[PDB]
Design a protein around this ligand. Structure first.
Ligand SMILES: CCCCCCCCCCCCCC(=O)SCCNC(=O)CCNC(=O)[C@H](O)C(C)(C)COP(=O)(O)OP(=O)(O)OC[C@H]1O[C@@H](n2cnc3c(N)ncnc32)[C@H](O)[C@@H]1OP(=O)(O)O
Lengths: 340, 338
């Protein structure tokens, strides 16, 4: 077994693209006076990070609202009603309150039954995969028939407040550099219905995978509702080191050889980080979908949004082996397999 | 069915160092009380919370949690290198990213194999964390798990007492922030293990979970503010608690006279009284610390369990019912055999 999941399936999947486009060109317009004062002559967003646009919601959209929208769409995709759901996990970085959980708010919106178990999982960009594993352990055992894993991310306030701080006459070069990665974040949402395979014999299978950690690096990227501070240089170097460890494990437990994988669904922090990742493991770039260029980094929703987009694009065929991979602040790294 | 091979290897709590009495709070509120014409001591006489504990300045959730974790490892007689899973279940949190668990894990020096993340579910999350860990242990993924929880209410007291002493405060504003004045600081941590590793240790059997998520608006909390519909929350909270207990009677086979301790969420005197009379539970079998510690959120249940353990009270075979509940509303009831 190697503790891989048996008879756990993806019954439904969906994403929501946030409606309002914010271009790096617009951003650079606002920041230009500060660029000039600091003597920055390069387009650090568009050319260095490789981000050309990102999407935002309306101001009044909460994490629970975006998650609820994705969940209803996924329920339709699995062709089931909310009454079938025995577990709902919300995995987002964004959250409505410290208490109650965002999951309870989403569950109240959807109308789950009084038998439905709900809670949040938080773990930066890897939480959706953590949520899938937790649901999978219940599904494999047969405690429930169907689960929802949900995730809505809102970056509105971080853009609003970061831009104000950075266009201050008094902003220091250090603060500017520290906060710049915030302007690579994006809004979006995703949700997945997982099921016992017996109920959905033709659905994709989720096998799980492996995780490794380097929690001595927990200071590298710190975020709250209106601020994210990031050591981008160190994140890259230490992130890659951690992935290599995780890849050794993936080869032991998953039996992975890169040329035998059909798709790589990778969490994205920037264009150069992704290029370094791919170069490191000899991955065929044709096997790596990216949406960072126009959606930026959607935190823990990124992986399932990309998977959902691949499905919607017709890129996924029966029997395709799909690798889910990411490095999340912590640091953590998880790699898991789906067989379409 | 129930967990078969899961034990509690170690357990610990931290009581916060500074006492804030209700008498001391009331002296501060008094001129607000004299305006508005309030002549009742709600905290002391009605809620029955006479004191709560605060941390030193700038103690973070992660610091409190790390403190409890080091104690719980000592209690379990294991080094951090044996921990394959660390879950942080606190309401309080350092940041949105990364997990507070990664910060505690960094403090402790966990290994590069150790899986970590947060579970958030108001005052229920410790029991949720226990069950998540239990499923991994049963499945052979790990040998030992830490479940940790540090709560800090310092800021909520500072900010709330500011608002309540404002010359503008109205009585309705006062009433819907009053519950914030029943919260308290503290921390707890638990080591869970595969039973073959720790044969004399208490067994955790798991339990049953019910929800009333239509009531998610009734208690809303951030670091600096908690707004609470006290009346409806007490009424619906006990409604769900009553339903989960009925479910527990069915699947765990529970009958009241056959349980030796009830370890319940620590809310208030009337909440407690209302629940205990529903099922004719002996109040002598229900340890309470809110009188002096207030409501410590999801850490309340394991803090009580730890105090019972340290009291040296419990005997082998004692059936201990863990009754958790949290804003949501969510309720979970589970059994430990000592
Ligand atoms: C399974 C788990 C089991 C756990 C146990 C059960 C949990 C269930 C809950 C689940 C939750 C989930 C998780 C959580 O923990 S979420 C947090 C919830 N915690 C709390 O609400 C604790 C704080 N509240 C209380 O202790 C009670 O609700 C109080 C004491 C407030 C009322 O208590 P009681 O029933 O006695 O109300 P009464 O109407 O008969 O008293 C009237 C008198 O008191 C006065 N007054 C009243 N309210 C307020 C106020 N807000 N502001 C100012 N004053 C107030 C009033 O003016 C009057 O004074 P006087 O006219 O006579 O001058």
């Amino acid at each position: 077994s190697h503790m891989l999941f048996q008879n756990v399936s993806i019954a439904g999947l969906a994403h929501i693209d946030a409606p309002h486009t914010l271009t790096s060109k617009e951003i650079n317009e606002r920041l230009q006076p500060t660029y000039d004062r600091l003597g920055i002559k390069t387009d650090v967003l568009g050319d260095v990070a490789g981000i050309h646009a990102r999407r935002l919601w309306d101001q009044d959209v909460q994490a629970s609202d975006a998650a609820t929208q994705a969940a209803r769409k996924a329920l339709i995709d699995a062709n089931i009603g909310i009454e079938k759901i025995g577990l709902l996990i919300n995995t987002s970085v964004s959250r409505d309150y410290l208490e109650p959980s965002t999951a309870s708010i989403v569950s109240g919106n959807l109308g789950v039954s009084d038998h439905c178990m709900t809670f949040d999982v938080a773990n930066a960009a890897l939480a959706f995969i953590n949520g899938m594993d937790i649901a999978a352990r219940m599904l494999e055992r047969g405690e429930i028939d169907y689960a929802l894993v949900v995730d809505g991310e809102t970056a509105n306030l971080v853009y609003e407040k970061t831009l104000e701080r950075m266009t201050s006459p008094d902003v220091t070069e250090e603060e500017f550099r520290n906060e710049l990665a915030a302007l690579t974040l994006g809004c979006g949402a995703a949700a997945m219905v997982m099921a016992r395979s017996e109920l959905v014999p033709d659905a994709p299978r989720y096998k799980g995978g492996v995780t490794r950690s380097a929690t001595e690096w927990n200071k590298l990227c710190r975020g709250n509702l209106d601020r994210m501070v990031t050591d981008t240089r160190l994140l890259l170097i230490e992130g890659i080191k951690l992935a290599q460890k995780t890849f050794v494990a993936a080869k032991q437990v998953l039996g992975w050889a890169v040329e035998e994988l059909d798709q790589f669904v990778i969490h994205q922090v920037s264009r150069p980080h992704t290029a370094a990742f791919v170069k490191s493991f000899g991955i065929d770039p044709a096997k790596v979908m990216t949406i960072f260029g126009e959606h930026g980094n959607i935190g823990p929703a990124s992986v399932p949004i990309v998977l959902s987009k691949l499905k919607e694009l017709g890129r996924l065929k029966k029997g395709d082996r799909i690798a889910l991979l990411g490095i999340g602040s912590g640091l953590n790294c998880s790699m898991a397999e789906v067989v379409w």
